[PDB]
C-alpha cells in the first residue's frame, strides 16, 4: 500500500501472508475463508512467461500477523499447503481474467482473537455493496512501516475503469481508487496482489470479501487505479472446489 | 455444502463481537449514505 495507516490489532483477522520458503519472504496477500481454505490471486502462483509455477511444497502461509519484522509469540500461526486450485479459465495471456486461486491448508487453523474468516458475498450483498462511489478496504504492507497497513478506496465507474488502462476489462473485474484530482489519499499497489478488498455490510455489520487485488497501475507506475477480481462472479467455482474435496 | 460459510464469518473478535469500532470503518459506512 501507499499512504495507508497502521492496522489495529485484530482489525483484519482473515489476513493471510503467502511466503516462499527459499528465500523465506512474502510473496503475496491472501485471505482466510474457513479453517482450511485460503483465497489468493492466481498470478501470485502461476505466470508462465516469468517461469512462475509454484507448487504446494514451495510455499507456506502465515496467519494472525500484525508485524512483518517480529515472530508474534502465541498469536501467529503457520500452515503448509495440501493443494492449490487455480481457476481453470485464468487468462494470464491477455488480462488476468479470473485471477483467483484456492489453497487447501494441510491442517485446519484454530480461530482466535487474531484469526477469523471473512464472509463471501451472496448475489444480494454484491448487488447492494459493489457500486461506484462506495468504499471498501485493502490491507497489505508498505511499499517504511513494519505493521499491516489499511487503505479505504472508492469503487470506480465501469467506463472510467476501462478508459484508465489498455487492458481489456471483463465483468469478472472491478476497479477502485481515488481520481487524479483527489490527490494522494491512499492506494493499493501491485505489491498488495492476492490480498482482499473487503466491505462492511450496513445490513448485518459483517465483513465481506468483494475483491482480490489483481494488479495496480498506480503507486510505482504512472497509472490511475487498482484492478480486482470480482469474488461474487467466481463464487460457484469456489463452492464447487470446497464441496468436491 | 460450504454455502454462506462459517455462521460466524466476517464478525471480528476484537471489534463486532465486543461492540468496538475500528478507527476508519465509519468512512466506509458513510460512503453508502454519500
Numbering used by the authors:
A (entry chain H): 16 to 36, 36A, 37 to 60, 60A, 60B, 60C, 60D, 60E, ...
B (entry chain L): 1H, 1G, 1F, 1E, 1D, 1C, 1B, 1A, ...
The authors write:
Members of the trypsin family of proteases participate in key physiological processes ranging from blood coagulation to apoptosis. A common theme in the trypsin family is that proteases are synthesized as inactive zymogens and then converted to the active enzyme by cleavage at residue R159 that generates a new N-terminus, typically at residue I16. A new H-bonds then forms with the side chain of residue D194 leading to organization of the primary specificity pocket, the oxyanion hole and other critical epitopes of the active site to enable substrate binding and catalysis. Hence, the I16-D194 ionic interaction contributes to multiple features of the trypsin fold and deserves attention.
As an alternative perturbation of the I16-D194 ionic interaction, the I16T mutant was also crystallized in the free form at a resolution of 1.7 Å and final Rfree = 0.20. The position of residue D194 is slightly altered and breaks the H-bond with the backbone N atom of G142, which in turn shifts the 141–143 strand, breaks the N143–E192 H-bond and causes the 192–193 peptide bond to flip. Perturbation of the Na+ binding site is particularly evident in the I16T mutant, where the ion pair between R187 and D222 is completely disrupted and the two side chains point in opposite directions.
